[PDB]
Amino acid sequence: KKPKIITIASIKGGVGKSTSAIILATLLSKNNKVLLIDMDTQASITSYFYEKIEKLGINFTKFNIYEILKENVDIDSTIINVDNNLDLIPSYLTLHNFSEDKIEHKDFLLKTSLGTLYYKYDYIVIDTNPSLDVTLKNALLCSDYVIIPMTAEKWAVESLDLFNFFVRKLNLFLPIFLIITRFKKNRTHKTLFEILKTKDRFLGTISERENKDYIKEYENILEIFLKKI
Amino acid sequence: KKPKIITIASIKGGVGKSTSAIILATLLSKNNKVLLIDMDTQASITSYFYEKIEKLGINFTKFNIYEILKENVDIDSTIINVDNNLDLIPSYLTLHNFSEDKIEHKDFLLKTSLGTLYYKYDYIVIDTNPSLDVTLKNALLCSDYVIIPMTAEKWAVESLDLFNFFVRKLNLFLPIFLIITRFKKNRTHKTLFEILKTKDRFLGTISERENKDYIKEYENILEIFLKKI
DSSP states (O other), X not given: OOOEEEEEXXXXXXXXXXXXXXXXXXXXXXXXXXXXXXXXXTOHHHHHTHXXXXXXXXXXXXXXXXHHHXXXXXXXXXXXXXXXXXXXXXXXXXXXXXXXXXXXXGGGHHHHHHHHOOSOOSEEEEEOOSSSSHHHHHHHTTOSEEEEEEXXXXXXXHHHHHHHHHHHHTTXXXXXXXXXXXXXXXXXXXXXXXXXXXXXXXXXXXXXXXXXXXXXXXXXXXXXXXXXO | OOOEEEEEOOSSTTSSHHHHHHHHHHXXXXXXXXXXXXXXXXXXXXXHTHHHHHHTTOOTTTSSHHHHHTTSSOGGGGOEEEETTEEEEOOOGGGGGGGTOXXXXXXXXXXXXXXXXXXXXXXXXXXXXXXXXXXXXXXXHHOSEEEEEEOSOTXXXXXXHHHHHXXXXXXXXXXXXXXXXXXXXXXXXXXXXXXXXXXXXXXXXXXXXXXXXXXXXXXXXXXXXHHHO
């Protein structure tokens, strides 16, 4: 076995990227050992788990993805058991410095650090900034798969082409899966859904929601995801 | 005189950066000619005026901020009159590739382009992405003033210092003004407020709210800003 590495990406903010990362990781953790890596400067994943992190007394100020990236700390030192079968490498606001940092072989830092990791996971789920930036490159050059939660807004198709172009540029051959989030049974979603539904990499829909109905929709998605890999 | 150029910036998303840009520019527009420059990859400002942009039939796939930065079009031809005394240079998804394009003197592209603008404005309000990136650098190096909206979240103060360290380093002359947005009466907002209210360039607070009272809060902010420059 080896870890199956999934990047959660979206070029649009507020479309449920980080929310999906958490819920998907959590569903996978029911029967798998899972690592979540919070490479989003927003740090929404780390903040979701903050109560658990504080209670464990973790010094994420010193042990976080940015410091892994700058090789000031080993990855082995940053890993937090935040839930059943679920580990986390947390994000911290110094990550904001990463786009401007001048580093040799900058794109392959996460790949290189993941190459040293002792601990073995079934799945690694990496959350990213909604930007086609150097962080996203570090994730993609690591990955086996990508999932893009996206909404039925103007420029949905075009954004897909934009993202694919970027991936092609990295000379990668990655399956990129699609999820329509904030879904409503209305006109504009029907237009996007009809275009998307015929893609082999389309996974399904998650309804807008202000054991629940949302979890089941995510379980569905996962089910289909696992049938296509 | 000459245009006064304000960048609205924040290194945290979902803090009302774009909304602030829109309302401050709209208020300024009552008695001034104002240009809004949508340099956020999110394109929220453009999306807010999209109904008017579409009624006008504009091709902002070709006439947009990214195409300016790449010197494929003249800035004059990108300008859209979106409201009373209010112009817009729109954003389009291709702005996402700007972080990775390799370009000489890349930091000064916006400043150079602004030097080819025929039209004269009283104020230019520039909206940016929540990142310490090259897009932010273009805005800042054009600008006379910076306004940062922020909210009472964990690491608000540390993030502000980081942004300061970034902004100071590429222009230590740039005044940085502060707003607290999404404001609520509770311990953790009170604490940020106690900290920020004593900073020379603190402007005030906007309440969380889903003619209005919040407009008049923006009016108060604009009033105290205009008195301080």
